[PDB]
Design a protein around this ligand. Sequence first.
Ligand SMILES: *[C@H](CCCCCC(=O)O)CCC(=O)O
Ligand SMILES: *[C@H](CCCCCC(=O)O)CCC(=O)O
Ligand SMILES: *[C@H](CCCCCC(=O)O)CCC(=O)O
Ligand SMILES: *[C@H](CCCCCC(=O)O)CCC(=O)O
Ligand SMILES: *[C@H](CCCCCC(=O)O)CCC(=O)O
Ligand SMILES: *[C@H](CCCCCC(=O)O)CCC(=O)O
Ligand SMILES: [Mg+2]
Ligand SMILES: [Mg+2]
Ligand SMILES: [Mg+2]
Ligand SMILES: [Mg+2]
Ligand SMILES: [Mg+2]
Ligand SMILES: [Mg+2]
Ligand SMILES: [Zn+2]
Ligand SMILES: [Zn+2]
Ligand SMILES: [Zn+2]
Ligand SMILES: [Zn+2]
Ligand SMILES: [Zn+2]
Ligand SMILES: [Zn+2]
Lengths: 323, 323, 323, 323, 323, 323
Amino acid sequence: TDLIQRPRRLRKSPALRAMFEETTLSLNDLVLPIFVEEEIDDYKAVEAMPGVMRIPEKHLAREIERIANAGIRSVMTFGISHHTDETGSDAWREDGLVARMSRICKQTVPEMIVMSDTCFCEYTSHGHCGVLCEHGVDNDATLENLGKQAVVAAAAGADFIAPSAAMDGQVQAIRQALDAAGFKDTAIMSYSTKFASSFYGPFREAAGSALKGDRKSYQMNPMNRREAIRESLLDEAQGADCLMVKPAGAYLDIVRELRERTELPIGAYQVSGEYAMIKFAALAGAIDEEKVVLESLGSIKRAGADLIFSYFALDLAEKKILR
Amino acid sequence: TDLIQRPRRLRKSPALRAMFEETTLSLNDLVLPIFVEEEIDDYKAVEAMPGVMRIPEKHLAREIERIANAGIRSVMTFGISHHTDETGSDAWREDGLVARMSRICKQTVPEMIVMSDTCFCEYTSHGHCGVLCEHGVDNDATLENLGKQAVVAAAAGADFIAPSAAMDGQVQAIRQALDAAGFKDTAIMSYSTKFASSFYGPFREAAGSALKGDRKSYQMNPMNRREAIRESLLDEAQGADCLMVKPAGAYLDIVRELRERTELPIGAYQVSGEYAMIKFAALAGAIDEEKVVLESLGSIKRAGADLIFSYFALDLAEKKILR
Amino acid sequence: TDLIQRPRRLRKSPALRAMFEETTLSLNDLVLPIFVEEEIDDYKAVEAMPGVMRIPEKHLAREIERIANAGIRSVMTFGISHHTDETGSDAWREDGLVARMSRICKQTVPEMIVMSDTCFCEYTSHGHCGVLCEHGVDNDATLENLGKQAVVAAAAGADFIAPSAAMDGQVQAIRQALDAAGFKDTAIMSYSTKFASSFYGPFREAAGSALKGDRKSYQMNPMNRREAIRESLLDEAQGADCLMVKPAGAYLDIVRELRERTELPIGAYQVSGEYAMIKFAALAGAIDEEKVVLESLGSIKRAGADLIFSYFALDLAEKKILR
Amino acid sequence: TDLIQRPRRLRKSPALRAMFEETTLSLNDLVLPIFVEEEIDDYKAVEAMPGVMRIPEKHLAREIERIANAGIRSVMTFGISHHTDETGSDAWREDGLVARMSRICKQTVPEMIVMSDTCFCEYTSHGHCGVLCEHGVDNDATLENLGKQAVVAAAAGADFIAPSAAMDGQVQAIRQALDAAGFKDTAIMSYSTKFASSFYGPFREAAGSALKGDRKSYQMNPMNRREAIRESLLDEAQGADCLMVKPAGAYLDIVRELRERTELPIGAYQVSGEYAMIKFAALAGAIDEEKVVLESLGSIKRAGADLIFSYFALDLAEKKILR
Amino acid sequence: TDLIQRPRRLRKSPALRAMFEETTLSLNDLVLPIFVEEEIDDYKAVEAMPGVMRIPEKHLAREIERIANAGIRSVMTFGISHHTDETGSDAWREDGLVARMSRICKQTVPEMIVMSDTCFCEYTSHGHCGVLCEHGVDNDATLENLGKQAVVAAAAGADFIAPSAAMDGQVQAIRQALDAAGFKDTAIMSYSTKFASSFYGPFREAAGSALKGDRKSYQMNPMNRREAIRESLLDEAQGADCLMVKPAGAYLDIVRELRERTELPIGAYQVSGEYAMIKFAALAGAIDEEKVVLESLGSIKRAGADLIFSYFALDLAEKKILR
Amino acid sequence: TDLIQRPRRLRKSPALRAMFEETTLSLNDLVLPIFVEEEIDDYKAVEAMPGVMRIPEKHLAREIERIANAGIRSVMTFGISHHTDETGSDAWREDGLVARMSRICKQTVPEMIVMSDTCFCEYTSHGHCGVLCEHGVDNDATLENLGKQAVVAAAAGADFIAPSAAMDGQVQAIRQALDAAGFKDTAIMSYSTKFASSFYGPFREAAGSALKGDRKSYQMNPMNRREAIRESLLDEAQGADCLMVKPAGAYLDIVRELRERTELPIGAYQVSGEYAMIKFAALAGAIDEEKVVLESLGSIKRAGADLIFSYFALDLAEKKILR
Ligand SMILES: *[C@H](CCCCCC(=O)O)CCC(=O)O
Ligand SMILES: *[C@H](CCCCCC(=O)O)CCC(=O)O
Ligand SMILES: *[C@H](CCCCCC(=O)O)CCC(=O)O
Ligand SMILES: *[C@H](CCCCCC(=O)O)CCC(=O)O
Ligand SMILES: *[C@H](CCCCCC(=O)O)CCC(=O)O
Ligand SMILES: *[C@H](CCCCCC(=O)O)CCC(=O)O
Ligand SMILES: [Mg+2]
Ligand SMILES: [Mg+2]
Ligand SMILES: [Mg+2]
Ligand SMILES: [Mg+2]
Ligand SMILES: [Mg+2]
Ligand SMILES: [Mg+2]
Ligand SMILES: [Zn+2]
Ligand SMILES: [Zn+2]
Ligand SMILES: [Zn+2]
Ligand SMILES: [Zn+2]
Ligand SMILES: [Zn+2]
Ligand SMILES: [Zn+2]
């Protein structure tokens, strides 16, 4: 044939595939979500998430030095509560689990970037992401409490307040409460586009949320691409330092669309259900885990994300697979 | 709080979420890939692809009829050969397996659109997608061969010749070859953007391809978003009736970018490893299969895919999940 | 002050600046240009290019091995001839210097991607980039010549034929010439947008080009941004596997504009005068070389360059500044 | 050959290269940054910047007539202080060096356009661009003082207040302070995109800033193209009359990107390190200075800049190289 | 009033308006159209074009030298024939007027770029731009003719063949004709978008064209903006080195639209009637000629014109209004 | 030739040129600017504007019935004053000339659309467009008076208040004053992009402005295309019902650019100098007036304007040339 065009020319060797590799993933792209249970003495393995386990609070300090030492520069704290009420009030206690989780990390490793998952689904009796009613999760009652929380997390050392509630106006809510209290420099990692997703399967088992029902009156419809972009652009207008798409894996078209519609940094969360799907298929021997893990993360980065939340971060770090 | 904008108003109930749902998935969207093994007696199920079976050519007509009753409009044919040589010429025999899968399918169900997987990886002794040489798979030697195959497939009744050899110029070669042979009406479903992906883990086992090494000198690098697009657009310029992104699951960005760069129909292949990841996590209790299968497939649709090749298609069809 | 937006939040620490850094430079990005002088005995260092040396063909294999050990993937070959005639035919000899630099390089290190600088300025008696006539450098006489050269280079093992004669139609002529000679697999790295720039000051000395006057009737005007783009796009239409902007340093706008006008890989050449400016100011104590070299190269990358031809590549490599 | 397209057609002669020159640089594009030291009797040559020297205040008046007479229509005043405190308070003194520098210029040459570099790095004990703390340079404490300064500079005759601090909200800060005090017509030349650059080498030697450390908690990361555009678009929203990219030379992709994202005029600063790199390479004989200077300035203009700050402005003016 | 934005700040003085002026006009931008009448003795001034004169071929070399001394780089040649037949073959004679105007010009001033007006309206007995038939001006009969003319012009020394017959396919025909004749280096300045405009009022008198009726079956309708663009883009596809909009004055929209639809140079012709309107109103005291001429020409430049054909060029040049 | 493309096909006949005419001009596009002198008994012909004359106020009523009867549906009133003070205060008198001019028109022809040129250049001693100072025309002092005027014009029946002062914030100024006084429905025809143009020659003679100097500290630079768009987009933000480009003729690139940047209606003013240039060239016999007038107006409409101010409107109307 007479093809002047031969794409295959640059795939002839490993050296050549390397010179022309358009995307590259490194360790500075990963944020390690960490699970921390108060009032427990020994490590609890999560079943649905092969290799992940709850860090007993009394060990938080040791592990976050371990995390820090393998090179992970950021963490997203999730707490498993033992003091859950109707409003989820522990979460905005001067020394609630939320605050302690932050304080212990920044104390133990000063330069470590601490993001605090700011919500109520793990601290509420009902397990919904906020204040519940004769109508459902009340949006504005939840914003007042998201603000109350933000300030104690900020106050306890988190570099980022990550509103995880999917409440309208949560970012603006949190910006003002943080400012008013003298926390003008504390940033917001907005879970801006957070879907009511079936990929969160393993997560209520991992961080013990006590909700039996669903979050579809606040977390958005997986199928709504226009609305997902709109969700994120509203948080930009409310001052978010960073936007986010969760889940990430089945929403890379969403991450790309958004990367072209804002100059802001974009995070993508590779959720428990994605980790679970990788882990359980490698066990059955169906796929090569390291291969599928690097390709998975790389696809996220290719779609446009600046930071990726992944539960594989530490192990990729330590086995020194990502430098 | 004075939020004028409140995304949650349209999420209040199931009726409102349905009124406003942006993307809807149907069975008209699904193409079912089928594996037929010649010269065997009973169905041989695939290990890494739980619930998937290798059909014995002797039941293929019983089967095409069952798929047809299910509501399914299209199938993609993949053959497991017993007559594998160095060039894989069972593929281009007037009566090779390839030609027999189409004629059986087309003969049993004349309404069925049969898409013929056009390659050599399952028919060569060495497992590569074509002619091997002292330097690698020869592009142009394989092109002449793909042509011979396409014409035997057309003549056997296949409505779509789908080149999966990831060879440069394949659409052009197949297009000429088909016109020259009086099949100017036979369409081409190009696997235009075909990545050298690790999500094909369970396919060497499912398809029975002999290959030991890698397909990186022809199948393209996962990280190259710009190249991905170039690949498909070169195929549009070559006359492909339909373009395709494969794998699809971790390439939703690619799907969306390409939807915006062409007016042509786009197919998306939810590959074997994707099928396996959902099965095993489901088996291991970590996720709700129905909810993940539906969400994964609809995501592919939301990103711009016109047609989605899925192994869950019959099951979704018969259980009447998608109409 | 009530600033909702505060860019500084993500600049507070080294850890945050790294999390959020948009562009990262690596050694995979660098191509090392090498000068080999035939018929000489010891290395002859270049005066205007402090630390750069003319390699004696008799050590080229010792050297390609050293570069190779450094981590370097690619080199661009420039030859200093002793056999210079009016058409510069040492360039198109089956055994000319051009063909010997490739074969030595390719023979010593078969993994090395050797890019062959394809021109006549270092091989003609008069120093021009081709055939001279009663009116100037003849475009089409030089095209036939570039073709002969490309084929001897391919046959010597060069993986890339890089036409630097700034002649109209060169990619097409070289592409045909290479296909006709059974090198349909040999790629073309076109110096597509090649400016008649004063940053090449130290190159007549480094390369030993005989030219006394100017190269303005073929190399293009620095001020023409629209022409710059036209130049490269004409080369994409002619089949170049890769495009290039040269010089790169003072043409970062050109790099960005072109990144937005093509999906093809783009190279950027940090020319001799750029190398010299950084050396001498560094020597004269005015700047920190490491910090300026790294920032200059990353800037090239930030603007859209896929590959950057730099004389600092080995030094950056061995001192292990870039991995 | 059969090329209908021959770009070379318009490069046949100097007359032709001229008719078709797309960009043109003149003297009205240059702003001359001038150095003025109080309490000194004789001119101080800067070492790192060959040909530049501090103007003793007692001579300011003579030189600015000289500047004005060669045709330079604008100046950017930089002061070398002898009264540096912790807050850098001299800079907002009714008759600080800042005010005197302006007053003396507008008095001496009424129609001369005076821009006043508004910052504190030259007037502070520590040499940081503002009010320093137990946390670092305090952003809002610095804005109150940037405003205080602006008003005395305005009051003393500067046509432009050029905030050089890289403090968030500095432009809005300065707009209000200027308005409130009756300086509604005094314009702001915002250093909107000002990187923490290694090209500023020679500058702490030239304007005596007493900082030992770096400005990376406020001046932005050289590698962040999206953020650089964002920085500039915020100052547009805050009322800046003019935007700016500093440094300019290795950031022409940035100047271009920005020229396409706003209708505002854009300045580009060719910093001390760029001047130094040109000057020291010409001395070593590596490049032709006039050639590299005009091409350097021309590239800046080509990228999209309306005004260029260059230390070569006066000498190009006088040697009558730019009219 | 609290206007943050105040456009007037940069209009306060002549110095500021000059600093910020977006478009600057020069003599390098001007092409001077010249009318040479063969077989006559003294200059014959044109009535409707006050100050414009028909040059007697016997002084053309005295004149080309005067224009040349003025600073003028280019001229467009228009001939007033005494040998007018039905096909206008004095135009394609080895020694016709057309060929003599170029050779005289090129012989007297070899630096001069001579653009040859390529048509038949001044050479045919009936005044039409080509061959007349029982149905109108024959497109293809005129194409063969334009070809013969272009080759005699090239051979006479003209650097630009400018087809003004408004015939379909003219660039292609002239391009082939010129290449075939070994003038692959002769450029083409196409009057690409040439309107059937009433601003040519004074040209039948100035050029001495015999036509009585209209040129609407070939010259295009003034109101068709979309067609205007199609016209020029078809000429870019045909290889024109330069495109043109004519008339220019009342087509500034066309100029801007086309600048945005091509990267090619664009010429703009300020036609005779435009020249006349400015003269007579000036004579009748209604306007200041210098100020209207300068503003009109700069407007053409602001709209995107690279080159402007103006009858005021020598006058502006000698009086030294534009340098 | 083999051109599949023949643009000439649709220009074969007058019927065909008509079916395919892209733009069309009718009478509903014209606004007739009318001149009205108070305290005079007989009509005053303007010299610089052949055919235009001042309407003595005592006849306004008769002529506006005449205007109305030929079909002109809108007028722009300009007054020649006999009571000119320093602030131009007559213009905001309950019964100033401004008010009377409006009142008399709406009284005499109710459905006639009356636009009131809102400025002070005809009512001031100095003739500048507002309040003059030790600094020049004071911007905000003028806005207070533009508002005062607006309300009496509104109050006296004008459908449009057309701020002609080129004062920053004039549209917002006028919106509020009109609202506050209960004139929420009175529209603003903003002279949004009004250049300091040399085409206004005949106008100070036509409406007796007593200014000797120029308006370049407020009317914008003819050469600033970016700024012209910016000027107009600010008036959109301030509530203008309609935008405008004046002059129109040499600024059609500006009208086009703007038509693509807003959804608002756009007016274009064919100024006195344009009329003058048409009129005086037709007298000399250089052009056909009706031809050049219709092509002139048509070009304006083609560039994108919705309404055109033309002094030829009445005569085109009456001679029934435009229906
Ligand atoms: C949201 C929990 C935060 C995101 C965790 C993502 C993951 O699955 O790893 C609500 C989750 C729920 O349905 O309980
Ligand atoms: C390509 C075979 C078609 C795609 C795989 C279908 C799937 O469900 O995985 C090459 C497969 C290979 O690498 O052998
Ligand atoms: C082109 C030679 C290749 C580019 C120069 C490489 C460098 O580092 O300067 C012509 C050079 C010349 O003008 O002789
Ligand atoms: C910013 C100083 C103003 C810009 C001067 C640019 C130049 O280098 O000429 C801080 C510079 C520092 O690091 O001291
Ligand atoms: C075209 C002649 C070239 C354009 C006119 C130049 C001018 O200044 O008017 C045809 C002219 C005609 O209609 O005869
Ligand atoms: C602005 C007067 C209103 C526009 C009239 C346009 C025309 O010329 O017909 C100031 C004009 C001046 O310079 O006096
Ligand atoms: Mg939201
Ligand atoms: Mg392909
Ligand atoms: Mg070229
Ligand atoms: Mg800023
Ligand atoms: Mg045409
Ligand atoms: Mg305005
Ligand atoms: Zn929650
Ligand atoms: Zn295959
Ligand atoms: Zn060369
Ligand atoms: Zn500073
Ligand atoms: Zn003609
Ligand atoms: Zn006025």
